[PDB]
Ligand binder design. Structure first.
Ligand SMILES: N[C@H](CCC(=O)N[C@@H](CS)C(=O)NCC(=O)O)C(=O)O
Ligand SMILES: N[C@H](CCC(=O)N[C@@H](CS)C(=O)NCC(=O)O)C(=O)O
Ligand SMILES: [Ca+2]
Lengths: 186, 190
């Protein structure tokens, strides 16, 4: 009832490294994490990001491989998360971890309903049902409200963390957020 | 003075301010020097983004106990001070850094209009140069073209934002990366 909110886009390289450390960190700090996927210029700036991600991975001993036409528009994966989530928030976190993990080993088109639905029976969900659910109008309206509520609450970018109403934007802000939680704020 | 950490920034940049309070000491701890390089190239979402940054600056400033009080109409187009830095460097690099240090201190305690040539020239004596000699230099069309060109060319070489640190060819963007960068210098890399 006082979770660390974890707002991210599945196509976010920085969210990938955050996704990954967030669970253990919140455990160390004795908090829960609420995972919240939501939808989101220069060549040289994109060239830098790539260098930075590779540089982060290399240091953490992580394998990191975005697909050739990164970033995917992860609409099917984002709809799938909230579909699962309505049934079981824990299954949804699990599903989210498997998206990041497959996406960033070059193994999942997160825009494809069909490809995303192959992740289901893995959270004990039939592809058919997941497929039906994300093709359901009420869920499509639900996911849209999630992101609009995000805008309305000042949430932008990925990863974005919200703890006790204090916002922290960025992967490199996780230790500051932790220091905020431990001290109670400054 | 051979392989410095290049410190690229905009004077009106809050995050560059905090880097500026830190860079020399880190560099001196690391056994490196710093090449200071100010440049002018450094419903929607940006009201949320601006509003986040000011909140973020205020808390960074509280935590470290630094003065952070931008002019009421922040950010200023810091054209005069940037030009002044390069005019100053021509005469003395060490003085250009002193001048730059001071500009940060003064701008972010609301004591300096960095868009004003007269106001900026007044920092001349503090560095050992005379205000109207400084005002002479920054009024020259060529220096104006030369300053701008440094920024333009930096952009073409893939320098963007504020602050941006280049050490031994390795780019580190943002106040947040000062920590990783230190590690990149100490460990020789990874
Ligand atoms: N994670 C922060 C930055 C986070 C970031 O800029 N991530 C991108 C996606 S990986 C983002 O916020 N989306 C673009 C946007 O801000 O609109 C860092 O350490 O550099
Ligand atoms: N990455 C941020 C810096 C990015 C940012 O929001 N600050 C501005 C200057 S105060 C910037 O670097 N501009 C980047 C751009 O123009 O894209 C940090 O941790 O310092
Ligand atoms: Ca200072």
């Amino acid at each position: 009832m006082n979770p660390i909110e974890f707002w991210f886009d599945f196509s976010s390289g920085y969210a990938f490294f955050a996704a990954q450390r967030i669970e253990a960190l919140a455990a160390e700090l004795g908090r829960t994490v609420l995972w919240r996927p939501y939808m989101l210029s220069t060549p040289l700036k994109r060239d830098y990001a790539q260098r930075d991600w590779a540089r982060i991975a290399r240091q953490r001993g992580l394998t990191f491989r975005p697909p050739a036409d990164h970033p995917h528009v992860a609409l099917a994966a984002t709809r799938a998360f909230y579909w699962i989530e309505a049934q079981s928030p824990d299954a949804a976190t699990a599903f989210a971890q498997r998206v990041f993990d497959l996406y960033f080993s070059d193994r999942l088109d997160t825009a494809s309903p069909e490809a995303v639905s192959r992740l289901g029976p893995e959270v004990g969900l039939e592809p058919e049902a997941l497929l039906a659910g994300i093709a359901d109008p009420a869920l499509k309206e639900t996911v849209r409200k999630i992101g609009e509520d995000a805008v309305a609450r000042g949430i932008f970018g990925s990863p974005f963390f919200l703890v006790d109403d204090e916002p922290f934007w960025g992967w490199d802000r996780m230790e500051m957020m932790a220091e905020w939680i431990r001290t109670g704020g400054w």
